[PDB]
Amino acid sequence: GHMTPELRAKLESLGRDLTPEMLGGTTQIFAAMATGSDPEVEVTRDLEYGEDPRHRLDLFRKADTRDAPVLVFVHGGGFVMGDKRLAETPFYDNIGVFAAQQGFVGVTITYRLAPAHQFPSGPEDLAAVVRWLKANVAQYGGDPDKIVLSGQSAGAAHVASYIAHKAHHATEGGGIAGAILMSGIYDTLTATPNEFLIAYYGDDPKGWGPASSMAGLINTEIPLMLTVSEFDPEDFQRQAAQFVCAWGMAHAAYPEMHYLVGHNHLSPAQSIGTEIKAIGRMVAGFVRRVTR
Amino acid sequence: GHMTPELRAKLESLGRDLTPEMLGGTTQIFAAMATGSDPEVEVTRDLEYGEDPRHRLDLFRKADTRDAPVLVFVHGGGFVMGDKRLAETPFYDNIGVFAAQQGFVGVTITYRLAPAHQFPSGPEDLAAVVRWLKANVAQYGGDPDKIVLSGQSAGAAHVASYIAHKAHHATEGGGIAGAILMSGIYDTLTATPNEFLIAYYGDDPKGWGPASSMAGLINTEIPLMLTVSEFDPEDFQRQAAQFVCAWGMAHAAYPEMHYLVGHNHLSPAQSIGTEIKAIGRMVAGFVRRVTR
C-alpha cells in the first residue's frame, strides 16, 4: 500500500535463499522505514508470563484503549534465535505500536529457544501467554476473549502448533478468536530437514510426525489467515501450497491464504508501520473480522 | 481498496450459490459505483475480428497513449450468455475505461456462445482477437508485444484454454505477455458437471478430457495471475485450490493466486473503477510487471 516496482526489484535481487545477505539486506531496508514508537502508545516492558528468563512479553496500548482486541506477535529466527526487540531497529515494536494505533492491545513475546528447549516447548509457551492474557489483559484495556495470535516463520510454526494440539490449549477450544500465520512451516513430515528444524524437533526427522501441525490446522474451527511471499524460499512456498491443497481436499473450499506480490520472507512483518500499508491493513482487517 | 465491513456483509448475505438473486444483487450494487466513461477516453465500438456476428471488440484509449500495454477483458456468463456491454450499467466499459486511464489500451470482446458453438470455439476466438490486435492495435496506441488477456468465470476458462492449447504455437508469433484468470474453471475432468459445462464442452462429461486446460496452465511459461473470491461458489474455490496443488507439485513453488477478502463471484471485476481500488490496482500492477 503501495510498494513500488523499484522496491520489488531490490527484494528480488536479494534472492530466495535464506542467507545472511538476504535477511540482513531486508532488515536494513525496512529498519529505516518502519515506525518503532509513538508518544501516544504506552509500552510496558518485560511482563513475566512464566519462570523462564525468556517468558517475557511487551504490552502496547493507547490511554483510551478499552475492551479491545489483543494482537499477539511471535517472532521468527529458525527456532534458535530472534527476539521481540532488535536494538538499533524498530522491530518488532513496529507491530506492537501499529496494533495500539489501530485500537488493539499489542503484545510481542519471547519464548524458550532451541536446541536447549525442543518441541513442545513452543506451544507450551504460547499456552502460558494465553493464560497470562486471560488473567491480566483486562487491566490494560484488552478483552480476553478477543485474542488473535500472529507469528512469522518459526513463530508461525509455534502458533500453528498451539492451534493443532489441544493438549496445549489454555482453555477449552483454545481460547483465541483467530490466528495469522506468515510464512510458516506446518507439516514436519513433508518439510525439508535442516539444522534449524533438527534443533527444535530433534535429531531424527523420522520421529517428527507427532509434531506436525497440518492435520490440526485443517481440522480447527479457529479462523486462520495465512500468507506466503512472492520471493519466499522454496520450502515456505511448498508448505503454503500443501496447506491450500489439504484444505481444499478436506473442505471443498479455498482458505484465507494471501499471496504477497513483491515481498520476501521478512518483508511483510517488517513493512508494518511503514508507508507500505497493505500488510498492516490486512492484519488489522482480519483482527476486526474475527473479534466483532 | 478499501471495501468496508458493511459491503462485505452485503455480499456475504447474498450467498455462495450462483443464483439470480446473488448475480443480480451484486451487479445492482456495483453498477451504481463504477465509472463507465471518461471524456478523455476515446472508444471505438465493434471492430470486427472475425466473420461471426459476435466477433466484435471495443477499444479504449487516451490521445497520448503510445506503445502501451494492451489489456483485453473476456466476460463471463456460463459460456451461454453475457456481453462486453450491459445497457443501463457501466459493465464492462468500466474495465476498458480503467485500462485507458492507467495508460493502457483497453479491449473488451464478445465471442461465439454455447451451445451453438462448443469447444474449441473459445480458444479459436481468443486466437483471432490476438491476431487482430497484432495487426491493428498500434494505431490505437498499443504495443502488439504487450498483450495481456484477462477473463472472469467462463471468460477465464476461455483465456486458460487459449494458454493451454494455443499460446505457445508459432501461429501466435511472440504470443501474449501475460494472463489474468478471475474465478475460472480450469480442469474439465474434476469440475462438477452442470448444464453450462454441458452446453460448451459437450453432452458427455466423460469426453471432456481433451478440453482440460490444467496441464497446459501448469506448463506454460506465460506469467499468470489468478484470483479466487471469499464468497465464490464451491466449484470455483475447488478449482482454484486444485490449481495451487498442481502448481506446487510441479514447480515446488506457489503461484500468483490471490485470495480476495470480502468479494464474491462477480464483485472483483465489477469493482474496477469504483472507489474500491484494490482489484484495479492488482490488475494494473500485474500488467506493468509482465510488459516491462
Domains and CATH numbers, chain B: 5-290 (3.40.50.1820)
B256 contact residues in A (CB cutoff 8 A): 230, 259, 261
Q: Structure solved using which method?
A: X-ray
Please give the Cα distance from A263 to A66 (Å, whole number): 34
Please give the Cα distance from A110 to B1 (Å, whole number): 34
Please give the Cα distance from B46 to B97 (Å, whole number): 16
Could you tell me which residues come within 8 angstroms of residue B40 by beta carbon, excluding any fewer than 6 positions away?
Answer: B62, B63
Q: Which three cell numbers stand for residue B219?
A: 506448463
- Burial of B66 by CB count in 10 Å (0-12 exposed, 13-18 middle, 19+ buried)? middle
Is-contact B210 B227, C-beta < 8 A? no
State which H helix or E strand residue A47 sits in. strand A42-48
Alpha-carbon radius of gyration of chain B: 18
Please give the Cα distance from B4 to B11 (Å, whole number): 11
Is-contact B105 B142, C-beta < 8 A? yes
Contact B228/A253, CB-based, under 8 Å? no
Q: Which of A249, A254, A259 is nearest residue B256 as measured by Cβ atoms?
A: A259
Is-contact B35 B91, C-beta < 8 A? no
- Burial of B99 by CB count in 10 Å (0-12 exposed, 13-18 middle, 19+ buried)? buried
Q: Rounding to the nearest 10 degrees, give the CA dihedral for residues A236, A237, A238, A239.
A: 50
Edge-to-edge strands, sheet with A224-229 = A42-48, A56-61, A105-109, A68-74, A142-152, A178-182, A224-229, A257-260
Please give the Cα distance from A78 to A199 (Å, whole number): 9
Measured from the Cβ of residue B189, the count of other Cβ atoms closer than 10 Å reads 11
Q: Which three cell numbers stand for residue A19?
A: 542467507
Please give the Cα distance from A66 to B269 (Å, whole number): 39
Helix, strand, coil distribution of chain B in percent, nearest 5: 40, 20, 40
Please give the Cα distance from B122 to B132 (Å, whole number): 15
Please give the Cα distance from A92 to A273 (Å, whole number): 10
Question: Apex CA A271: angle with CA A186 and CA B101, to 5°?
Answer: 110
Residue B144, phi then psi, degrees to nearest 5 = -65, -10
Q: Which residues pair with A44 in a beta bridge?
A: A59
Q: Which three cell numbers stand for residue A83?
A: 527476539
Is-contact B143 B96, C-beta < 8 A? no
Burial string for B26-59 (b: 16+ CB within 10 Å, else e) reads: bbebbbeebbbebeebebeeebebbebebbbbbb
Contact A241/B254, CB-based, under 8 Å? yes
Q: Which of B2, B71, B74, B8 is nearest to B264 (CA)?
A: B8
A153 CA: distance to closest CA in chain B (Å): 16
* Inter-CA distances, B204 with B81, B193, B197, B199, B241, Å: 21, 9, 10, 10, 25
Note the helical H segments in chain B: 5-14, 20-31, 93-101, 121-136, 154-165, 195-201, 214-219, 234-251, 267-270, 278-290
Is-contact A113 A54, C-beta < 8 A? yes
Q: If you count them, how many residues does chain A have?
A: 292
B184 CA: distance to closest CA in chain A (Å): 14
Contact B252/A234, CB-based, under 8 Å? yes
